[PDB]
């Protein structure tokens, strides 16, 4: 439950929002992370989300 709010805070800042995507992926809530990874063009994040 924690890194969900951590990623929300990072997106609120919007500077480390890639790290917010990383945290969202770590939370298992790939539905929120996949859209952001596609938008940011992070194929590493996309592959990590798809495998996990």
UniProtKB/Swiss-Prot annotation:
TPR repeats (start-end): 14-47
Subcellular location: Cytoplasm, Cytoskeleton, Cilium basal body; Cytoplasm, Cytoskeleton, Microtubule organizing center, Centrosome; Cell projection, Cilium
Assembly description: Component of the IFT complex A (IFT-A). IFT-A complex is divided into a core subcomplex composed of IFT122:IFT140:WDR19 which is associated with TULP3 and a peripheral subcomplex composed of IFT43:WDR35:TTC21B. Interacts (via C-terminal region) with IFT122 (via C-terminal region). Interacts with TTC25. Interacts with TTC21A.
Known role: Component of the IFT complex A (IFT-A), a complex required for retrograde ciliary transport and entry into cilia of G protein-coupled receptors (GPCRs). Plays a pivotal role in proper development and function of ciliated cells through its role in ciliogenesis and/or cilium maintenance. Required for the development and maintenance of the outer segments of rod and cone photoreceptor cells. Plays a role in maintenance and the delivery of opsin to the outer segment of photoreceptor cells.
Disorder noted: Short-rib thoracic dysplasia 9 with or without polydactyly: A form of short-rib thoracic dysplasia, a group of autosomal recessive ciliopathies that are characterized by a constricted thoracic cage, short ribs, shortened tubular bones, and a 'trident' appearance of the acetabular roof. Polydactyly is variably present. Non-skeletal involvement can include cleft lip/palate as well as anomalies of major organs such as the brain, eye, heart, kidneys, liver, pancreas, intestines, and genitalia. Retinitis pigmentosa 80: A retinal dystrophy belonging to the group of pigmentary retinopathies. Retinitis pigmentosa is characterized by retinal pigment deposits visible on fundus examination and primary loss of rod photoreceptor cells followed by secondary loss of cone photoreceptors. Patients typically have night vision blindness and loss of midperipheral visual field. As their condition progresses, they lose their far peripheral visual field and eventually central vision as well. RP80 inheritance is autosomal recessive.
Full protein name: Intraflagellar transport protein 140 homolog
Species per Swiss-Prot/TrEMBL record: Homo sapiens (Human)
Residues of the full protein shown: 1065 to 1116 of 1462
């Amino acid at each position: 439950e924690d890194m969900i709010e951590a990623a929300r805070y990072y997106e609120e800042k919007g500077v480390q929002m890639d790290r917010a995507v990383m945290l969202y992926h770590k939370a298992g809530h790939f539905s929120k992370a996949l859209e952001l990874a596609f938008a940011t063009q992070q194929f590493v994040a996309l592959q990590l989300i798809a495998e996990d």
